[PDB]
Coordinates of C-alpha atoms in Angstrom, one line a residue:
Chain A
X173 CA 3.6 59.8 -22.6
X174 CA 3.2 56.8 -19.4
X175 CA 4.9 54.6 -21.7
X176 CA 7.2 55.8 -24.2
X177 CA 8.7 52.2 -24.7
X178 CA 9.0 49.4 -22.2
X179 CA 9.3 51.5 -19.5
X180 CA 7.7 49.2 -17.2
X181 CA 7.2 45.4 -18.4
X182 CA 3.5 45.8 -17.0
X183 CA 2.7 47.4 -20.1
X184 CA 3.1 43.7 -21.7
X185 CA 0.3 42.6 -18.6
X186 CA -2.2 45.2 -19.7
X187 CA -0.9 44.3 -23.6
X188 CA -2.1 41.0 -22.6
X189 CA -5.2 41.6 -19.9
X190 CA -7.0 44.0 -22.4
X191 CA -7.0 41.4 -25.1
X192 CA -8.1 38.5 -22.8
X193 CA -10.8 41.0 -21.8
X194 CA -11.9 41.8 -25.1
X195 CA -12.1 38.1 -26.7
X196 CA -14.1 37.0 -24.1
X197 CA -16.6 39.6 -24.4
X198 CA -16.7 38.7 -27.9
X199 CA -17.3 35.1 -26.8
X200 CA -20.0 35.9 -24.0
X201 CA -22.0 38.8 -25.9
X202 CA -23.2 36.7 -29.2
X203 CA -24.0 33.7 -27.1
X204 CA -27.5 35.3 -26.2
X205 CA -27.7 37.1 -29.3
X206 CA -27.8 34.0 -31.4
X207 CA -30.9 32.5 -31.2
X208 CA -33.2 35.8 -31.3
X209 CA -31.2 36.4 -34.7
X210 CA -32.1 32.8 -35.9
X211 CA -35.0 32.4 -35.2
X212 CA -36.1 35.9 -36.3
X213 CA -34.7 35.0 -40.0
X214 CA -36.1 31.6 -39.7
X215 CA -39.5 33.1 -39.2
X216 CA -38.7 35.7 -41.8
X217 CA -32.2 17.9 -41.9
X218 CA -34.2 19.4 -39.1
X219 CA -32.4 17.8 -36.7
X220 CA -29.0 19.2 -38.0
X221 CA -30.7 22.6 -38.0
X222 CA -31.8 21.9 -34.6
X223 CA -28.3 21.0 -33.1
X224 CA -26.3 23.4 -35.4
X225 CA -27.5 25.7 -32.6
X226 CA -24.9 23.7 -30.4
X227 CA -22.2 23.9 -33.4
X228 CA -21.9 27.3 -33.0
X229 CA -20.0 27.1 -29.7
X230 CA -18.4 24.0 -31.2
X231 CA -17.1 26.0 -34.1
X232 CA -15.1 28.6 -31.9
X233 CA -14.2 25.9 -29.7
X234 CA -12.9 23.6 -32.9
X235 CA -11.1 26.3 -34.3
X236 CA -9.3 27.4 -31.6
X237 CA -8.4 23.6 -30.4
X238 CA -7.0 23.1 -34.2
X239 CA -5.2 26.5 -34.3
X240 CA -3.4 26.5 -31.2
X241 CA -0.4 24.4 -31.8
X242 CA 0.4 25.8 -35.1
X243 CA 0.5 29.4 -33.6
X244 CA 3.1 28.0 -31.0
X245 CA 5.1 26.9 -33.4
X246 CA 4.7 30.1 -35.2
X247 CA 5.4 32.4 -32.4
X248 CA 9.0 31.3 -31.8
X249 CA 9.5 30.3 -35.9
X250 CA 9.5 34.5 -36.3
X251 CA 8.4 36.3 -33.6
X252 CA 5.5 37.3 -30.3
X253 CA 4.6 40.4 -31.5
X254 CA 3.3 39.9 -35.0
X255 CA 0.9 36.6 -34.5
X256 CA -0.8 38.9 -31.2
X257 CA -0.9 41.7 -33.8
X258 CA -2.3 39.2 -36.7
X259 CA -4.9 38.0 -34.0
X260 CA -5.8 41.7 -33.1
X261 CA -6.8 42.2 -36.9
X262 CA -8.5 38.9 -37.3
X263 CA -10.5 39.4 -34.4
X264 CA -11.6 43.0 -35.3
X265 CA -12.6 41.7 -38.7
X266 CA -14.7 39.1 -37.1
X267 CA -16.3 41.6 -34.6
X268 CA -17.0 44.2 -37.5
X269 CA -18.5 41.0 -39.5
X270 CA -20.7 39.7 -36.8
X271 CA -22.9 42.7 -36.7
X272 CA -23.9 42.9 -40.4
X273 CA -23.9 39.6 -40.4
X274 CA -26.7 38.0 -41.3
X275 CA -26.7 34.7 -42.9
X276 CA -25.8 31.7 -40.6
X277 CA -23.2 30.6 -43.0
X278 CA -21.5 34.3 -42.3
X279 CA -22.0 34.3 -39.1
X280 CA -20.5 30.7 -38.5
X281 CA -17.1 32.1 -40.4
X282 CA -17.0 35.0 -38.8
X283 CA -16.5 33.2 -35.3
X284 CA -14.4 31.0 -36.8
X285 CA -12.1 33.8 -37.6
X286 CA -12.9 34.9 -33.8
X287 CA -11.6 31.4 -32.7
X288 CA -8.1 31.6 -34.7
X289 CA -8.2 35.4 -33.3
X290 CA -9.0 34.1 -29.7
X291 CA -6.4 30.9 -30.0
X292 CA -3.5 33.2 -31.5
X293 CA -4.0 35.9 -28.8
X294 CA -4.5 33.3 -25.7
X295 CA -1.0 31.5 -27.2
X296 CA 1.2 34.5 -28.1
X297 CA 0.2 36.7 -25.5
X298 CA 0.7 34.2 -22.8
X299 CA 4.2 33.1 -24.4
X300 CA 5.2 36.5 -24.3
X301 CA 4.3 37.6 -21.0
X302 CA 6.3 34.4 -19.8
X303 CA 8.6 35.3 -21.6
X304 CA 9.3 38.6 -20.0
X305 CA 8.8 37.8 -16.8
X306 CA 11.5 34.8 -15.9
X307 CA 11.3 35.3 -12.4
X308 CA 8.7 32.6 -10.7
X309 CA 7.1 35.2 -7.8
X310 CA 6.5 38.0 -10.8
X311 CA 5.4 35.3 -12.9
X312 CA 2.5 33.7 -10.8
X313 CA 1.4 37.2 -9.7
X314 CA 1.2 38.5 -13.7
X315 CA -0.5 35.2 -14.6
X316 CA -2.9 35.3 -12.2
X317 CA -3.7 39.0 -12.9
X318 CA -4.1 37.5 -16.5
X319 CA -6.4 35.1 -15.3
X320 CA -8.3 37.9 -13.4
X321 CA -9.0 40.0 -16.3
X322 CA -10.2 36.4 -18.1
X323 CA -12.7 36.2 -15.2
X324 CA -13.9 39.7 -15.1
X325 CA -14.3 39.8 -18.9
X326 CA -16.6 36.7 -18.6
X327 CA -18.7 38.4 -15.7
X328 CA -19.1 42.0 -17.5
X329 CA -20.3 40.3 -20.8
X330 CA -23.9 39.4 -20.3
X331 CA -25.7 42.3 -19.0
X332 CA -22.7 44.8 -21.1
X333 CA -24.4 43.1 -24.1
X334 CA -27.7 43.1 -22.8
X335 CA -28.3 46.2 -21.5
X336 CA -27.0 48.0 -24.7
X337 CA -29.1 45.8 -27.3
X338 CA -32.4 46.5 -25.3
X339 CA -31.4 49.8 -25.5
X340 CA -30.6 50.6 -29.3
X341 CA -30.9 47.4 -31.6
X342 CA -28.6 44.8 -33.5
X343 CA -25.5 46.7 -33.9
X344 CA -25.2 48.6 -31.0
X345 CA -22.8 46.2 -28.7
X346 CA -20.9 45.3 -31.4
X347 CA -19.8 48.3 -33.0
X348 CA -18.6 50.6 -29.4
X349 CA -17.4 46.6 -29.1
X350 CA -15.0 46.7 -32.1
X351 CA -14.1 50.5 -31.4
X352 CA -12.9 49.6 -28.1
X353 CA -10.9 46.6 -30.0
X354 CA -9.3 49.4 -32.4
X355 CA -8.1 51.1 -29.5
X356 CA -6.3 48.5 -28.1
X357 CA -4.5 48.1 -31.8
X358 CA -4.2 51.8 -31.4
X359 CA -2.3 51.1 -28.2
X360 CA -0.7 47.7 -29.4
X361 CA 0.8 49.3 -32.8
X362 CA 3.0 51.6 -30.6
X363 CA 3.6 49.4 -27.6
X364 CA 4.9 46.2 -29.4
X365 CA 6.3 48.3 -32.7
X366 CA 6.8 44.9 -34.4
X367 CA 8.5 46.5 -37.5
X368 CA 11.0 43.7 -38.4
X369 CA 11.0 40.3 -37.6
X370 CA 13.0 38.7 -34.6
X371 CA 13.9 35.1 -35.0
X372 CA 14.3 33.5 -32.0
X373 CA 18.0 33.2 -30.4
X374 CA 16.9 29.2 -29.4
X375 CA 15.6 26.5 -30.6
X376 CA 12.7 24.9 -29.1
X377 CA 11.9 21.4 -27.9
X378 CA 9.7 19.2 -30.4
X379 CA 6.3 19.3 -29.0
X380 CA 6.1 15.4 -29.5
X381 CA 8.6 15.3 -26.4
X382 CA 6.6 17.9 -24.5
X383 CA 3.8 15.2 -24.9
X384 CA 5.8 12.7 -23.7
X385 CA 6.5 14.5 -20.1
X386 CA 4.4 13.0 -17.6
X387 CA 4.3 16.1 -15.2
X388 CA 3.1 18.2 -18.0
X389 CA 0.7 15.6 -18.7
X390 CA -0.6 15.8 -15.1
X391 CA -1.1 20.3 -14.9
X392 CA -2.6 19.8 -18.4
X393 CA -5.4 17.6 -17.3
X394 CA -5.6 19.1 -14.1
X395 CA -6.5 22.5 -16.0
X396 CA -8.4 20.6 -18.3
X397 CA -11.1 18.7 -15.8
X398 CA -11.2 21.5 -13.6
X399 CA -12.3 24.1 -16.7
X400 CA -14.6 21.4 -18.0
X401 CA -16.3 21.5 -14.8
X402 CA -17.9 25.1 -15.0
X403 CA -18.1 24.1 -19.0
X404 CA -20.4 21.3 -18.2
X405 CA -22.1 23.0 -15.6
X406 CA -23.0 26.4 -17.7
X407 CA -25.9 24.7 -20.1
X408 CA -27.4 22.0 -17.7
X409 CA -28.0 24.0 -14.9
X410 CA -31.1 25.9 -16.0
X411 CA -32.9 23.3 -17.5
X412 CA -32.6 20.9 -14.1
X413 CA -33.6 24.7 -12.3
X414 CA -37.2 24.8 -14.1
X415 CA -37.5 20.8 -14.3
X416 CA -37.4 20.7 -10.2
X417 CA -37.7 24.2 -8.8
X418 CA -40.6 25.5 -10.3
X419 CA -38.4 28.3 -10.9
X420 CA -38.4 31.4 -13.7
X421 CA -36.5 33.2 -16.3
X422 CA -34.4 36.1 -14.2
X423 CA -32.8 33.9 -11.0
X424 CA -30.6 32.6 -13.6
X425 CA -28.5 35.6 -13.9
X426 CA -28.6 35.7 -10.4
X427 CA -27.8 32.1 -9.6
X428 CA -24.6 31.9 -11.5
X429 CA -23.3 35.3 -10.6
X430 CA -21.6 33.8 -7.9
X431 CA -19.2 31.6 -9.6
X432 CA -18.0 34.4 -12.1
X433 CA -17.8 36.5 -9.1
X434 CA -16.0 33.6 -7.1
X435 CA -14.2 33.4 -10.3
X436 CA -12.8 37.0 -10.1
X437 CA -11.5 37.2 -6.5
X438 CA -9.8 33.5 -6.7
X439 CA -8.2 34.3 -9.6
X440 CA -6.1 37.1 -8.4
X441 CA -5.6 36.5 -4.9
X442 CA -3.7 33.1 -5.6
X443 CA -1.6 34.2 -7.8
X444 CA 0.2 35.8 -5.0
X445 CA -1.4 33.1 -2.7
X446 CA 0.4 30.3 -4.2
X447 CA 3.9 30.7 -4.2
X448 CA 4.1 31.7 -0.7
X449 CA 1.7 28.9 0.4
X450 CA 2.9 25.8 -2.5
X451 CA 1.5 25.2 -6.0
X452 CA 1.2 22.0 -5.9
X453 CA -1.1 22.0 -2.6
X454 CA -2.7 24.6 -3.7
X455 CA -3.9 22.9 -6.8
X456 CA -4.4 19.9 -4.6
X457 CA -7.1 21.7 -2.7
X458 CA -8.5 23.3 -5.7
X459 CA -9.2 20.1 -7.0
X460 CA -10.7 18.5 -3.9
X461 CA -13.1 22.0 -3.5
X462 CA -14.2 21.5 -6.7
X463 CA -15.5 18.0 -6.3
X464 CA -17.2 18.7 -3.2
X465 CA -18.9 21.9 -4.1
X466 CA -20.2 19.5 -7.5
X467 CA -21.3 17.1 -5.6
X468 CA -23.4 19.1 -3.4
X469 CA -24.7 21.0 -6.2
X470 CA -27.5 18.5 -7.2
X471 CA -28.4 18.0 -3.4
X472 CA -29.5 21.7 -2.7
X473 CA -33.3 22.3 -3.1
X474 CA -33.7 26.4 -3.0
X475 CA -32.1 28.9 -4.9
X476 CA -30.3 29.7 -1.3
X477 CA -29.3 25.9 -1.8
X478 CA -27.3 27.0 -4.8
X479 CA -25.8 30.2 -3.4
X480 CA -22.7 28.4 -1.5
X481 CA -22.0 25.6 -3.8
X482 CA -21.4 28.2 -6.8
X483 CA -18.9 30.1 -4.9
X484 CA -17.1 27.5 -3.9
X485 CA -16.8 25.8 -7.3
X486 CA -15.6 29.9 -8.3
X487 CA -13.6 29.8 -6.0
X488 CA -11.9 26.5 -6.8
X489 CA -11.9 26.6 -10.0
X490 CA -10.0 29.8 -10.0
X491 CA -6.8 28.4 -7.1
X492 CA -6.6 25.4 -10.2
X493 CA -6.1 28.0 -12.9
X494 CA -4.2 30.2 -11.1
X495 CA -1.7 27.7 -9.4
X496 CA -0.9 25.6 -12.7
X497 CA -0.9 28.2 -15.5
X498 CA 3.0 29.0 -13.9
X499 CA 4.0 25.7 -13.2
X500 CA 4.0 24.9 -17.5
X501 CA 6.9 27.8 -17.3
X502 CA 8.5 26.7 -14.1
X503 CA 9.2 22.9 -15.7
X504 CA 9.8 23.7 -18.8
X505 CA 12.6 26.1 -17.8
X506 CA 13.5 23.8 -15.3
X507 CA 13.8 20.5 -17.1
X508 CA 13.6 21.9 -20.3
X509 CA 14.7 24.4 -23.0
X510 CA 13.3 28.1 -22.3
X511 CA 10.7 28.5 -24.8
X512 CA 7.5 28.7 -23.5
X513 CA 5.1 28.7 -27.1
X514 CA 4.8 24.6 -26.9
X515 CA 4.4 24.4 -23.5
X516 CA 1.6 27.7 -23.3
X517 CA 0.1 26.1 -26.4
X518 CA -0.3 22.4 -24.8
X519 CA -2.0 24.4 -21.7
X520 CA -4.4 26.3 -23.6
X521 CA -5.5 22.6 -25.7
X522 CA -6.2 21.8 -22.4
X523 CA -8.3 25.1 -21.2
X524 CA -10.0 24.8 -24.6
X525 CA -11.2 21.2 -24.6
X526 CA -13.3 21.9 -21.5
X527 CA -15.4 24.4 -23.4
X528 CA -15.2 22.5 -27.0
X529 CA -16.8 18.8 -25.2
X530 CA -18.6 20.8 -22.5
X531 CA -22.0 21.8 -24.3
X532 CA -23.0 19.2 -26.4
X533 CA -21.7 16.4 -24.3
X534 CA -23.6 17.2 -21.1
X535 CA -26.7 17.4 -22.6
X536 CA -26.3 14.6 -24.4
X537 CA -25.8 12.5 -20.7
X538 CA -28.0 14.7 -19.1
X539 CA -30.6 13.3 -21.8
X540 CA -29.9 9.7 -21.3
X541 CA -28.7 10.1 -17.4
X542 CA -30.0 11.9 -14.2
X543 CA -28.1 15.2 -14.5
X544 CA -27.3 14.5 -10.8
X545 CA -25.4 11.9 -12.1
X546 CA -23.9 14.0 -14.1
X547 CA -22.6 15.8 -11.4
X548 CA -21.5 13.1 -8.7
X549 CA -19.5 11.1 -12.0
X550 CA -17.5 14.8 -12.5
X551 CA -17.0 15.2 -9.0
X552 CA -15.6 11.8 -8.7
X553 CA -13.5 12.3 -11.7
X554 CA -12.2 15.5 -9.9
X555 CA -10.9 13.4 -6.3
X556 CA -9.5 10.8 -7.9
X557 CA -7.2 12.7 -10.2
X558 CA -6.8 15.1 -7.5
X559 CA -4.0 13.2 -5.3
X560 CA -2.0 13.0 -8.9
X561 CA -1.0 17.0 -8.1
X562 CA 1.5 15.3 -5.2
X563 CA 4.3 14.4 -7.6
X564 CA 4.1 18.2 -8.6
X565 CA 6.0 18.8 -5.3
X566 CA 10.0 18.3 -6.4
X567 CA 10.1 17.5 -10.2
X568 CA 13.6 15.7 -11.3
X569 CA 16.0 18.1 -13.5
X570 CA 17.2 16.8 -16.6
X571 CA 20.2 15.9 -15.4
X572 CA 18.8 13.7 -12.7
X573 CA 17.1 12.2 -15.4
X574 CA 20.2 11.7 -17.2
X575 CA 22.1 10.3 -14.9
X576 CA 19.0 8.1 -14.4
X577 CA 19.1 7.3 -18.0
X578 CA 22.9 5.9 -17.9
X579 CA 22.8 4.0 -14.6
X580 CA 20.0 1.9 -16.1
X581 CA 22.3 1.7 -19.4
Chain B
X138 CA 38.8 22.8 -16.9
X139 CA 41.2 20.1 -15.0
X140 CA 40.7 18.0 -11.9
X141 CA 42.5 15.8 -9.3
X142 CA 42.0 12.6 -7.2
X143 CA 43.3 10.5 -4.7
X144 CA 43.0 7.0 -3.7
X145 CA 43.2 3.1 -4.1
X146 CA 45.5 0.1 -2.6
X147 CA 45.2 -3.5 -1.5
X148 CA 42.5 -4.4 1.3
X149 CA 41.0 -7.6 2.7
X150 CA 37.4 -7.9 2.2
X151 CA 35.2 -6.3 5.1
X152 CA 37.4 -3.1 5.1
X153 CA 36.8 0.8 4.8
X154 CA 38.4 3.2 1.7
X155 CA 37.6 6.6 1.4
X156 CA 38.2 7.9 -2.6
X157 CA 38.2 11.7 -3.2
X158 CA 38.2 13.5 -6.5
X159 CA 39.1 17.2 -6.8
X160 CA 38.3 20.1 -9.2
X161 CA 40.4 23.4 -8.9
X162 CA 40.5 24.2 -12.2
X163 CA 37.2 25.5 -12.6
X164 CA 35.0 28.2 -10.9
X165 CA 32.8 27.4 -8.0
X166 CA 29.5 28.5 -9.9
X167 CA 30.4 26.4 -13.2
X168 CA 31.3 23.6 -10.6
X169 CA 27.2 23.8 -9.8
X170 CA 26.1 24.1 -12.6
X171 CA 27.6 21.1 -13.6
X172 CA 27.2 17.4 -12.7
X173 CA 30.0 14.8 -11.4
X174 CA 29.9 11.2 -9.8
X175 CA 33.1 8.1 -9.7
X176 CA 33.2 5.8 -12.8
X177 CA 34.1 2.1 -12.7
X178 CA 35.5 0.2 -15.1
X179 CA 36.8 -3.6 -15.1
X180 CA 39.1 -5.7 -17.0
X181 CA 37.3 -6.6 -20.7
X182 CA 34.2 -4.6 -18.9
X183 CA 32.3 -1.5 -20.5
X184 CA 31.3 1.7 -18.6
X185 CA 28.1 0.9 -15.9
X186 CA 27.2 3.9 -13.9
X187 CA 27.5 3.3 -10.0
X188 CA 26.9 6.3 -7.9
X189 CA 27.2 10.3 -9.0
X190 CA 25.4 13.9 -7.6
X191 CA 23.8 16.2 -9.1
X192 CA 22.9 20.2 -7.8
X193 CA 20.1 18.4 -6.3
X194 CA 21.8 16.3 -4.6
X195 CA 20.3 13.1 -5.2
X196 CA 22.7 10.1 -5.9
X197 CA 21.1 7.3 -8.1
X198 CA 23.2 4.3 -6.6
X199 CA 23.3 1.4 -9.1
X200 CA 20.8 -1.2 -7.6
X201 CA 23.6 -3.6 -6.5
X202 CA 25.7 -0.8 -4.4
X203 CA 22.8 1.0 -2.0
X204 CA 24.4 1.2 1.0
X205 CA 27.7 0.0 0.1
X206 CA 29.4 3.2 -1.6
X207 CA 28.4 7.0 0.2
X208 CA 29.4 10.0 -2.3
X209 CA 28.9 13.6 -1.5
X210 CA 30.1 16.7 -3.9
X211 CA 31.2 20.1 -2.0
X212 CA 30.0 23.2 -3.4
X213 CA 32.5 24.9 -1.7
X214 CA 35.3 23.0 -1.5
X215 CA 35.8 21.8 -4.8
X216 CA 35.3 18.4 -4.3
X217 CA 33.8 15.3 -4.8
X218 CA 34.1 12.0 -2.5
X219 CA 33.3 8.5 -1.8
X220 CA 33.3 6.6 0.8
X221 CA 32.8 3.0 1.3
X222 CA 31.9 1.0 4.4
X223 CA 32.2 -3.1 3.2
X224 CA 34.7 -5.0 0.5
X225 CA 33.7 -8.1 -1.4
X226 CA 35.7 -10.1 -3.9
X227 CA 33.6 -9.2 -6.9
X228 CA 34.7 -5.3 -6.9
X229 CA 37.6 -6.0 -9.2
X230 CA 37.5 -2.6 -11.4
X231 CA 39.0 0.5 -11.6
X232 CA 37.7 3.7 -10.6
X233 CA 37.5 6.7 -13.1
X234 CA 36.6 10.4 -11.9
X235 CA 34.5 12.0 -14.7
X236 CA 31.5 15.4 -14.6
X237 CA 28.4 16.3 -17.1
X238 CA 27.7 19.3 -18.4
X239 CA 24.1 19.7 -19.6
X240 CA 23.7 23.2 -21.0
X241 CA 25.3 22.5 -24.1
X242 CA 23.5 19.1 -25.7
X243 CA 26.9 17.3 -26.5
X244 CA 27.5 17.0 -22.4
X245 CA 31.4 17.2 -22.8
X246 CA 33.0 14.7 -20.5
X247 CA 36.4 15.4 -19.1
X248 CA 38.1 12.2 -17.2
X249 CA 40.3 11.7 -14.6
X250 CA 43.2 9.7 -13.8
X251 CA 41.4 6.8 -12.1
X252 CA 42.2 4.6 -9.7
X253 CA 42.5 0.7 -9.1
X254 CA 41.0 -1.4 -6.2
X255 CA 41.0 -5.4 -6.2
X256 CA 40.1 -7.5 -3.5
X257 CA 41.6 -10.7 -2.6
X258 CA 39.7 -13.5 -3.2

C-alpha cells in the first residue's frame, strides 16, 4: 500500500502524532465526565472524598511522573518499538475499562494504567522519532509537528466528548474512542513489526550525570515553568470569572478557546520558525511573552479583556515547547552519547510536573492568596528565569570541557 | 597516526619563539575530529596543561600564560603552532607535542618528540 515498510520516515511522525492525539483525548474527555459519574453514584473522611476529586488528575499525573524514567531506561535496555506497542495495549485496556467502569476505585486504576500508557508512549515515541531523524532542521520541524498534534488533541477533546455523550449516553465517546485506538494498533502492528528484540548498538549515559548538566537543567525547567503556567491557569480561571464578572456557565468554553487555538498555530509554525531565527532567542521571548500576557491576565475586566492575553500566553507557551523539545537532542548528541531515552525522559518529568502540581496547588494559594497574586508571583517566576535561556546560545563540547578539566588539574 | 615538530634554543628574556607541531600522518577529517595543544614539562615537575585547541577553537590558556603563549591549529594544513611574544626566567620546561581523541572513552594520547627552552636567569 502507501507504506509497505519505511518508505518514508514520516510514517514514524504520524506513528507518533496519532498516539499523542489519542492520549490526550483520553486525558481531556473523562475530565468532565467525572464528576456527573460521582455524583450520580453518590446520590444513588469527607474531606478526603471531597479532594479525591483533585486526586484523580493527581493520579495520572503521579503515575506518569514515576513511570517515566524507568521506560527510558527500558527503551534503549531492548528496544523503541515494543514499550510504544506495550503502551498502545495498556492504554486500550484503560480506555475499554473506563466506560464500564463504575466504581471509583476502578476507575482510579484504570487511569492509572492510562498514565503508564501515556508516560511510555510520550517517552518511547519521542526517543524514537529522535532517533530517526539525526538531522537538527528535520528534527525541530517533526517535533514541533509532534507538538502540533499535542495541541490539536487537547483542543478537539471537550466538545468531541461532549457532543457525543449528550447525544447517546455513558459509553458512547469511549467506545468509537477505543476503536479509533485499535486502529492505530492496526496500523502500528505492521508499521513498527517489532517481532524480535533489538538491543541497542550503545550504551547510554547514566542518568545521574544527565542530572548533573547544568544546560539540561536550564531547557528542563524552562519547559517545566512555562507548561505549569497554562496548568495553573486551567482550574483558577473560572472560579475568579464568576467571583468578579458576574459571568455564566458557556463563556468558559469560549474564553479559553483561544489559548488551545494559540496553542495549535505556535506550535507548528516555530518548529520551522526556530532554527532559522535561533532557539535560544526564541525561547528567550517565549518566556518573556508568557510573563507579560500572565500578568495582564488578572488586570482585564470583560471577557474582551481576556481575549488577547489568552492568545498570547498560547502563543508563548507554544515558541517554549517548540524551541526546547530539540535542543535535549541537539546537546546530548553534542556533548554527549547519542541516546536520546534519558534525555526525552528528563524532558517529559519536566512537561509532567506542570500538570501533576498545577491543580491542587493553585487552588490551594488561590484559597489562602488573591489569585491575582497568583498570577503576578508566576509571571515573575517566568522573567526572572527567563534571561537563564542566554547560555543556551554556544554550549561547550565535551572536549572543551576536557581540556577544561585537565588545565585546572 | 605520527606527527612532527620543530623548535627550541637559547634566548634572553624579553624575546620572541615561534614553536610548530605537525601531523601528516593522519587524514584531514580525523585531524578535526580530534583535539591537540603543546605540553610542558620541567625538571622533577608533573604534566600542567598550558594552552591547546579544540574544533571549536577555543584555547583554555592556563591562568598564568593569557597573553603570553598564542596557539592556532590548521584544518588544512596539518598543523598546530605556537607562538610566543615575552621570555621570563621561570619558563624552564620542556615542551611536548601531544592530541585527544574523544570518541573512544580511553582518549589515546600519542606524543611527540618535545622540545627544550630555558632562559637565562
Amino acid at each position: 500500500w502507501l507504506q509497505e515498510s519505511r518508505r518514508s520516515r514520516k510514517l514514524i511522525l504520524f506513528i507518533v502524532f496519532l498516539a499523542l492525539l489519542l492520549d490526550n483525548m483520553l486525558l481531556t474527555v473523562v475530565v468532565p465526565i467525572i464528576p456527573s459519574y460521582l455524583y450520580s453514584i453518590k446520590h444513588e473522611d469527607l474531606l478526603n472524598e471531597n479532594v479525591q476529586v483533585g486526586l484523580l488528575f493527581a493520579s495520572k499525573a503521579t503515575v506518569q511522573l514515576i513511570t517515566n524514567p524507568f521506560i527510558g531506561l527500558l527503551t534503549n535496555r531492548i528496544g523503541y518499538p515494543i514499550p510504544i506497542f506495550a503502551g498502545f495495549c495498556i492504554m486500550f485496556v484503560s480506555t475499554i475499562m473506563f466506560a464500564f467502569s463504575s466504581s471509583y476505585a476502578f476507575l482510579l486504576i484504570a487511569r492509572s494504567l492510562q498514565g503508564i500508557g501515556s508516560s511510555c508512549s510520550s517517552v518511547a515515541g519521542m526517543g524514537m522519532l529522535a532517533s530517526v531523524y539525526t538531522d537538527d532542521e528535520e528534527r525541530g520541524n517533526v517535533m514541533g509537528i509532534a507538538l502540533g498534534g499535542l495541541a490539536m488533541g487537547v483542543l478537539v477533546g471537550p466538545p468531541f466528548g461532549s457532543v457525543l455523550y449528550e447525544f447517546v449516553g455513558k459509553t458512547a465517546p469511549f467506545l468509537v474512542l477505543a476503536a479509533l485506538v485499535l486502529l492505530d494498533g492496526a496500523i502500528q502492528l505492521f508499521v513498527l513489526q517489532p517481532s524480535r528484540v533489538q538491543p541497542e548498538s550503545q550504551k547510554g549515559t547514566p542518568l545521574t550525570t544527565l542530572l548533573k548538566d547544568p544546560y539540561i537543567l536550564i531547557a528542563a525547567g524552562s519547559i517545566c515553568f512555562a507548561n505549569m503556567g497554562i496548568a495553573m491557569l486551567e482550574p483558577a480561571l473560572p472560579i475568579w470569572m464568576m467571583e468578579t464578572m458576574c459571568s455564566r456557565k458557556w463563556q468558559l468554553g469560549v474564553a479559553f478557546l483561544p489559548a488551545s487555538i494559540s496553542y495549535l498555530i505556535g506550535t507548528n509554525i516555530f518548529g520551522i520558525l526556530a532554527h532559522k531565527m535561533g532557539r535560544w532567542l526564541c525561547a528567550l521571548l517565549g518566556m518573556i511573552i508568557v510573563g507579560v500576557s500572565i500578568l495582564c491576565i488578572p488586570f482585564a475586566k470583560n471577557i474582551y479583556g481576556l481575549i488577547a492575553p489568552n492568545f498570547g500566553v498560547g502563543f508563548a507557551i507554544g515558541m517554549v515547547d517548540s524551541s526546547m523539545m530539540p535542543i535535549m537532542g541537539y546537546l546530548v548528541d553534542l556533548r554527549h552519547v547519542s541516546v536520546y531515552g534519558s534525555v526525552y525522559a528528563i524532558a517529559d518529568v519536566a512537561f509532567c510536573m506542570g500538570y501533576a502540581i498545577g491543580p491542587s496547588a493553585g487552588g490551594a494559594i488561590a484559597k489562602a492568596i488573591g489569585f491575582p497574586w497568583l498570577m503576578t508571583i508566576i509571571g515573575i517566576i517566568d522573567i526572572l528565569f527567563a534571561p537563564l535561556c542566554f547560555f543556551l546560545r554556544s554550549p561547550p563540547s565535551r572536549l572543551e570541557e576536557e581540556l577544561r578539566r585537565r588545565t585546572e588539574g | 597516526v605520527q606527527l612532527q615538530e620543530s623548535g627550541g634554543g637559547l634566548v634572553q628574556p624579553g624575546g620572541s619563539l615561534r614553536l610548530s607541531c605537525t601531523a601528516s600522518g593522519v587524514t584531514i577529517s580525523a585531524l578535526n575530529a580530534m583535539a591537540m595543544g603543546w605540553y610542558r614539562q620541567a625538571p622533577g615537575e608533573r604534566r600542567v596543561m598550558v594552552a591547546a585547541v579544540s574544533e571549536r577553537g577555543n584555547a583554555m590558556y592556563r591562568e598564568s600564560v593569557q597573553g603570553r603563549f598564542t596557539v592556532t591549529r590548521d584544518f588544512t594544513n596539518k598543523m598546530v603552532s605556537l607562538q610566543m611574544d615575552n621570555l621570563k626566567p621561570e619558563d624552564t620546561a620542556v615542551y611536548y607535542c601531544h592530541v585527544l581523541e574523544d570518541r573512544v572513552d580511553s582518549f589515546h594520547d600519542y606524543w611527540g618528540q618535545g622540545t627544550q627552552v630555558t632562559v637565562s636567569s
